[PDB]
């Protein structure tokens, strides 16, 4: 799974 | 009630891990109509990310089960119906925050930082709607996500330094948008790679306040590239 | 939905970590009035534990914030609100136990399981009971655990997971509610030692649970026999 | 530390 921000 | 009270109670809610209480508190604060302070916008953001995050996570678990019960009729139909119930909650949560953004947050922003923050947020919550949107994958809410992200992207590039955590964070999320929602890995990698390469060229500009945030996001960008480039 | 369907939905809810839904399904299974299977007992138990457990964890945090002049009322008010939610969940489970589960529990294993649960939910009430720490509701907790303990020693082997889990929580009750470290250690030690002398009598289906509770007894023993 | 109990 792709990381995004905030998590 | 008074705003220093509502905020106090949001922080207490946050310590108790009662994210719906924290959300309701910050929704009330934003409906008072005044620009949020930084602290207030950060609390509002944490609260909703947690409320919607519980639903996104449940939805993924139940969708996976639905897939894996292909050929197991009773199981797959129950998984289907449960996924639809969860979707309705998720869509309600997103519509809640998107209405907050349209009515108050975006119209009162007033500083480029805050404007980029809130357009990113509008792209994010439309990206969450897109994840479950009727067509079992994507739909015309895709354009709302993309256009909020694009306007954030142009402003951040003009008004902020490349190591700024809000600019880096939007690049990160917009690239996830290209990769997952638009199924466009090359464009996703190019955006993530440019943001990473431009921040790393200006390590100098890292600030004592933003050092930690910036550095974490720079690593997230690099990990997405690693993940999306998986081949060798 | 129908009963088998409520149970399937409860397992789905568990996987999705939607413990309110899970408890609502097991509650409706219970209110139908038929004796529960082993699987339906475990599901009811895990669902309420997670639901009440979130209030217990929240109450600790807010309780503590509050005890550590101007603001403070706020923390107190929030603690009371969380407390009411806690008490409501414990009364919900206690009522299900008293109206459907205990009265028609026809097998010894079920009666012990339900009397232990009655023990547990009175214990959770006692942790918050008026005085900020412990009222004469502690007696309801003790009574239920004591009857469960005597039935379990009489009808179950020492390695049965339900007899073990009951000794573990009864031990915790002696330590935390009755404030008796020596009675808690004595209860836990005797449970562990009797089980370890008969590992031989463990079945393939319960060996993992039995052995996990045995370590929990041992960890409490180390913990309650610790040094500052 | 918190005492352990079962189910957790």
Swiss-Prot record, chain C:
Instruction: Give the main location.
Output: cytoplasm
Q: Which SUPFAM superfamilies match?
A: 14-3-3 protein (SSF48445)
- Modified-residue entries (Phosphothreonine), positions: 228
A GO molecular function assigned to this protein is: phosphoserine residue binding
Instruction: List N6-acetyllysine occurrences by residue.
Output: 3, 68
Modified residues annotated as N-acetylmethionine in this record: 1
Q: In this UniProt entry, which residues are annotated as the site Interaction with phosphoserine on interacting protein?
A: 56, 123
Q: Which residues carry this modification: Phosphoserine?
A: 58, 180, 203, 206
Has keyword Phosphoprotein? yes
Supply the alphabetized keyword list.
Acetylation, Cytoplasm, Host-virus interaction, Phosphoprotein
Name the consequence of residue 228 to A.
Loss of phosphorylation by CK1
Subcellular localization(s) per the UniProt record: Cytoplasm; Melanosome
A GO cellular component annotated for this chain's UniProt record is: focal adhesion
What CDD domains does the database record attribute to this sequence? Answer: 14-3-3_beta_zeta
InterPro entries tied to this protein: 14-3-3, 14-3-3_CS, 14-3-3_dom_sf, 14-3-3_domain
Q: Does the keyword Manganese apply?
A: no
Entry comment on modification after translation: The delta, brain-specific form differs from the zeta form in being phosphorylated. Phosphorylation on Ser-180 by MAPK8; promotes dissociation of BAX and translocation of BAX to mitochondria. Phosphorylation on Thr-228; inhibits binding of RAF1. Phosphorylated on Ser-58 by PKA and protein kinase C delta type catalytic subunit in a sphingosine-dependent fashion. Phosphorylation on Ser-58 by PKA; disrupts homodimerization and heterodimerization with YHAE and TP53.
The annotated consequence of residue 226 to W reads: Found in a patient with a neurodevelopmental disorder; uncertain significance; gain-of-function mutation in signal transduction; changed regulation of ERK1 and ERK2 cascade; increased interaction with BRAF; increased interaction with RAF1; loss of phosphorylation by CK1 at Thr-228
What this chain does, per the entry, is described as: Adapter protein implicated in the regulation of a large spectrum of both general and specialized signaling pathways. Binds to a large number of partners, usually by recognition of a phosphoserine or phosphothreonine motif. Binding generally results in the modulation of the activity of the binding partner. Promotes cytosolic retention and inactivation of TFEB transcription factor by binding to phosphorylated TFEB. Induces ARHGEF7 activity on RAC1 as well as lamellipodia and membrane ruffle formation. In neurons, regulates spine maturation through the modulation of ARHGEF7 activity.
User: Which family would the database say this protein is a member of?
Assistant: Belongs to the 14-3-3 family.
Q: How does it assemble?
A: Interacts with CDK16 and BSPRY. Interacts with WEE1 (C-terminal). Interacts with SAMSN1. Interacts with MLF1 (phosphorylated form); the interaction retains it in the cytoplasm. Interacts with Thr-phosphorylated ITGB2. Interacts with BCL2L11. Homodimer. Heterodimerizes with YWHAE. Homo- and heterodimerization is inhibited by phosphorylation on Ser-58. Interacts with FOXO4, NOXA1, SSH1 and ARHGEF2. Interacts with Pseudomonas aeruginosa exoS (unphosphorylated form). Interacts with BAX; the interaction occurs in the cytoplasm. (Microbial infection) Interacts with Epstein-Barr virus protein BPLF1 and TRIM25; leading to inhibition of the type-I IFN response.
**Record protein name field:** 14-3-3 protein zeta/delta
The organism encoding this protein is Homo sapiens
Lineage, uppermost ranks: Eukaryota, Metazoa, Chordata, Craniata, Vertebrata
Q: Which gene encodes it?
A: YWHAZ
């Amino acid at each position: 799974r792709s990381h995004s921000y905030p998590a | 009630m008074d705003k220093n009270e509502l905020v106090q109670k949001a922080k207490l809610a946050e310590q108790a891990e009662r994210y719906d209480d924290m959300a309701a508190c910050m929704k009330s604060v934003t409906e008072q109509g005044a620009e949020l302070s930084n602290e207030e916008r950060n609390l509002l953001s944490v609260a909703y990310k947690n409320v919607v995050g519980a639903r996104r996570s449940s939805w993924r678990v139940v969708s996976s089960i639905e897939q894996k019960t292909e050929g197991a009729e009773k199981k797959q139909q129950m998984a289907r119906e449960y996924r639809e119930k969860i979707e309705t909650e998720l869509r309600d949560i997103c519509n809640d925050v998107l209405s907050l953004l349209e009515k108050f947050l975006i119209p009162n922003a007033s500083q480029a930082e805050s404007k980029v923050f809130y357009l990113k947020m509008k792209g994010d919550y439309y990206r969450y709607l897109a994840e479950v949107a009727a067509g079992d994958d994507k739909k015309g809410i895709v354009d709302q996500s993309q256009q909020a992200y694009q306007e954030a992207f142009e402003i951040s590039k003009k008004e902020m330094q490349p190591t700024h955590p809000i600019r880096l964070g939007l690049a990160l999320n917009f690239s996830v948008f290209y990769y997952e929602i638009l199924n466009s890995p090359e464009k996703a990698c190019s955006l993530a790679k440019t943001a990473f390469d431009e921040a790393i060229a200006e390590l100098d500009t890292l600030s004592e306040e933003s050092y930690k945030d910036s550095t974490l996001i720079m690593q997230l960008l690099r990990d997405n590239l690693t993940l999306w480039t998986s081949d060798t």
